[PDB]
Amino acid sequence: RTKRERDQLYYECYSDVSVHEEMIADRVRTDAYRLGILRNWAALRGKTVLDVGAGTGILSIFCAQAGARRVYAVEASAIWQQAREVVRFNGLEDRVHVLPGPVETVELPEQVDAIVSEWMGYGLLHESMLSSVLHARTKWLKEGGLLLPASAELFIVPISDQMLEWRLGFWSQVKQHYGVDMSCLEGFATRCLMGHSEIVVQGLSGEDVLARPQRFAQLELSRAGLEQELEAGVGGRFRCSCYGSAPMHGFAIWFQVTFPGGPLVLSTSPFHPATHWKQALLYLNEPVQVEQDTDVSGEITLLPSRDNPRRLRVLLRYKVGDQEEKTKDFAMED
Amino acid sequence: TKRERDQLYYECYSDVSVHEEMIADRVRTDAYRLGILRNWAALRGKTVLDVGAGTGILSIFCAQAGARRVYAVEASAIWQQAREVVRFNGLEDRVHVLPGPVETVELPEQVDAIVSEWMGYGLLHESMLSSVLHARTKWLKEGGLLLPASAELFIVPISDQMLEWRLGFWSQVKQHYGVDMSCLEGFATRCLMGHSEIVVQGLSGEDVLARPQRFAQLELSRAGLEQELEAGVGGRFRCSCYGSAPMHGFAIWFQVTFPGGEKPLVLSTSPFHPATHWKQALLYLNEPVQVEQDTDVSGEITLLPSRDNPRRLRVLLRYKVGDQEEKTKDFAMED
Numbered sequence A: 001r002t003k004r005e006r007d008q009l010y011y012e013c014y015s016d017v018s019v020h021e022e023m024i025a026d027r028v029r030t031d032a033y034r035l036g037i038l039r040n041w042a043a044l045r046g047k048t049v050l051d052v053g054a055g056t057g058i059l060s061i062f063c064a065q066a067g068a069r070r071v072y073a074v075e076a077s078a079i080w081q082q083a084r085e086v087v088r089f090n091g092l093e094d095r096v097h098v099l100p101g102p103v104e105t106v107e108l109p110e111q112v113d114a115i116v117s118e119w120m121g122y123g124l125l126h127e128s129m130l131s132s133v134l135h136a137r138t139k140w141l142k143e144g145g146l147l148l149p150a151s152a153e154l155f156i157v158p159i160s161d162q163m164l165e166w167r168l169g170f171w172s173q174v175k176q177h178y179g180v181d182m183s184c185l186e187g188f189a190t191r192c193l194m195g196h197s198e199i200v201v202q203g204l205s206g207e208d209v210l211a212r213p214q215r216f217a218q219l220e221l222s223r224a225g226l227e228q229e230l231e232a233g234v235g236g237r238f239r240c241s242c243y244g245s246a247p248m249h250g251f252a253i254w255f256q257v258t259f260p261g262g263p264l265v266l267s268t269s270p271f272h273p274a275t276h277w278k279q280a281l282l283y284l285n286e287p288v289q290v291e292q293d294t295d296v297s298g299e300i301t302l303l304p305s306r307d308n309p310r311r312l313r314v315l316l317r318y319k320v321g322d323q324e325e326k327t328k329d330f331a332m333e334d
Numbered sequence B: 001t002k003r004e005r006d007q008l009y010y011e012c013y014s015d016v017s018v019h020e021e022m023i024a025d026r027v028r029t030d031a032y033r034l035g036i037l038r039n040w041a042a043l044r045g046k047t048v049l050d051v052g053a054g055t056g057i058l059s060i061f062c063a064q065a066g067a068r069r070v071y072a073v074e075a076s077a078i079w080q081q082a083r084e085v086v087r088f089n090g091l092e093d094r095v096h097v098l099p100g101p102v103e104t105v106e107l108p109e110q111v112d113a114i115v116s117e118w119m120g121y122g123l124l125h126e127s128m129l130s131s132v133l134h135a136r137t138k139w140l141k142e143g144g145l146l147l148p149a150s151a152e153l154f155i156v157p158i159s160d161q162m163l164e165w166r167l168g169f170w171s172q173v174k175q176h177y178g179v180d181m182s183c184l185e186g187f188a189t190r191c192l193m194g195h196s197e198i199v200v201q202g203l204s205g206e207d208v209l210a211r212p213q214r215f216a217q218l219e220l221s222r223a224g225l226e227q228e229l230e231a232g233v234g235g236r237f238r239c240s241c242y243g244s245a246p247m248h249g250f251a252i253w254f255q256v257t258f259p260g261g262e263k264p265l266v267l268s269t270s271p272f273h274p275a276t277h278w279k280q281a282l283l284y285l286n287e288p289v290q291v292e293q294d295t296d297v298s299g300e301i302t303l304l305p306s307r308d309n310p311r312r313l314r315v316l317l318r319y320k321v322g323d324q325e326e327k328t329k330d331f332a333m334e335d
């Protein structure tokens, strides 16, 4: 668990095909990038581009398609070699240069006019890749250079997870299929499925959402102090009113990023088309009954785990109705 | 280590999800339910040992079938749940949950019957069978009943439709996004087929390229089956392919059979039969091999305990497809 060792296990996660298949099969994600780049054709055409964490090289090829004279495809995972092949195969080794290793130590022969990166982990910040994109902003991007995407926003809403509700109810159904009453295991099932401290990644829809979603932070990637803030913790307070009666199981958070125009939003909301990011769930220890107009408020902080700086931690303080304020501390599931 | 390897194995059964998964599997749970009931005459008035009772469900079916007493032995912390359930259905006086390994537990007597659901992925992953046989030798009366009484293992060549699309994915990129990535096909094959892990996945009869071959039969009451099985089980197989297909390797699966009352009841994990939570276990070739109608596929397979972890299934495979040279691959159960 040295920094080197942990860096090297993280990179190796990207050296297998399955994640790249998943990213690229994510049409919502991949198109937002393709379209987001192509619409900035104006500021790209003949200009220079650093793709932070190029993976298979897809986004770097999009940039060349938008008219960039030269692209630096920087990547620390062994997948750089696959990227190199994709570039040679599409006839582009002259305009797209694959560079192995970390963006923090890579040596480019010049400053760039723009940066592209798909750096977003589950709950936006799991992986901590944003520090790497910001390190690269400060070290390689020219004064008033373009960032794609340029900003990110984070959102929270209380939920009544219908899937979880079905799973907790399961035990009460055992009697009618098999003739054995197992309804007494509901508490156990609740302790197992809600009373842990893991961030749970799951796909929700409208019918899980108990109120108006609230934005609790906004990250302007050009902003001065943003590096320091990520390490100290990003987040904010929130409040909303419940729509009606329901067992509330906790909250979901999700994010969007925004590319500038020639104004394109990539959203991971449960009201919008599904992405491989799904949403990140923060379950309370047990369900709480809510009603129409039940106040639910609190404060949320996303920050690095203590033992692993690439692992997402969420500190959550919250209040439901007339219940006393409570506190829960979560870390991203393995 | 050992105590340690075991506490870790038992801790995988202390969470709710695996029990939910097992009990939501109606094919499994009904087969036990009905396997036990069909055996009413031999349990009525008798004593049973439920090896790995879990939430206690199987012990309760034995009581519902008329067993005078059931000893529910369970080494995972889930035994506390089994007790709560036994008490809740009003059965404390008839089903006794006994915490701990079946190996060291103290029953107050020998039993007339053992019931156990001990089957891992690929039948023998977990190696719970050892536990069941130890209990049989130690605690089962002579002439005693086992449930299920037998197990059989089947292999067949396959073309995994899902895998095919995933290998095909890279050739389709061009059309979805105007970037040719067909050249990653080889890379995908390496990652997806060129490893040495047994892959657990659900197939359908359409993934199957020939007639399934039984390669091993395990008769649980056979004395000396314990030693026999140290070496490993398996055998040779042969079959002929149905048609043109890209062959990706083999699927293996099992069934278990309960004795008739009423005749024998089989619980199958075949891709041709209703899906169960075992799925099948897939043994992939390093790359696909194109086969045709009547292409001969032959080989040999041994399922054996991995060297540093006896609870981890190892499969050794020898095989020949058509006119290609004989090949070899050594597989171990995924994590």
Ligand SMILES: Nc1ncnc2c1ncn2[C@@H]1O[C@H](CSCC[C@H](N)C(=O)O)[C@@H](O)[C@H]1O
Binding pocket: A011, A014, A020, A023, A024, A052, A053, A054, A055, A056, A057, A058, A059, A074, A075, A076, A077, A079, A101, A102, A103, A104, A118, A119, A129, A132
């Ligand atoms: N500091 C760093 N330097 C270079 N690459 C990095 C990095 N941190 C993360 N990465 C890489 O960044 C990638 C993010 S996933 C996105 C890959 C590709 N751009 C695509 O859109 O499909 C991974 O390939 C990961 O290995």
Ligand SMILES: Nc1ncnc2c1ncn2[C@@H]1O[C@H](CSCC[C@H](N)C(=O)O)[C@@H](O)[C@H]1O
Binding pocket: B009, B010, B013, B019, B022, B023, B051, B052, B053, B054, B055, B056, B057, B058, B073, B074, B075, B076, B078, B100, B101, B102, B103, B117, B118, B128, B131
């Ligand atoms: N040596 C041993 N002694 C007691 N229990 C064991 C054991 N080896 C495995 N087990 C337990 O056996 C169970 C297998 S799963 C079957 C659970 C339950 N009988 C049902 O049908 O749903 C697990 O709960 C596991 O913890």
Ligand SMILES: NCCN1CCC(Cc2ccccc2)CC1
Binding pocket: A013, A014, A019, A022, A023, A118, A119, A120, A121, A122, A276, A277
């Ligand atoms: N820019 C990262 C976009 N995705 C990548 C896939 C998910 C994380 C993951 C990495 C590696 C292996 C498995 C899973 C979620 C974030």
Ligand SMILES: NCCN1CCC(Cc2ccccc2)CC1
Binding pocket: B012, B013, B018, B022, B117, B118, B119, B120, B121, B277, B278
């Ligand atoms: N008698 C075991 C029947 N199932 C139970 C679950 C599967 C193995 C597993 C155990 C524990 C956690 C995850 C997965 C397959 C075998």
Ligand SMILES: NCCN1CCC(Cc2ccccc2)CC1
Binding pocket: B124, B125, B127, B129, B130, B133, B225, B226, B227, B229, B230, B232, B233, B303, B304, B305, B312, B313, B314
């Ligand atoms: N150690 C006591 C004897 N058991 C008896 C049952 C055997 C089960 C098995 C066979 C083959 C592969 C894996 C698992 C293993 C040894």
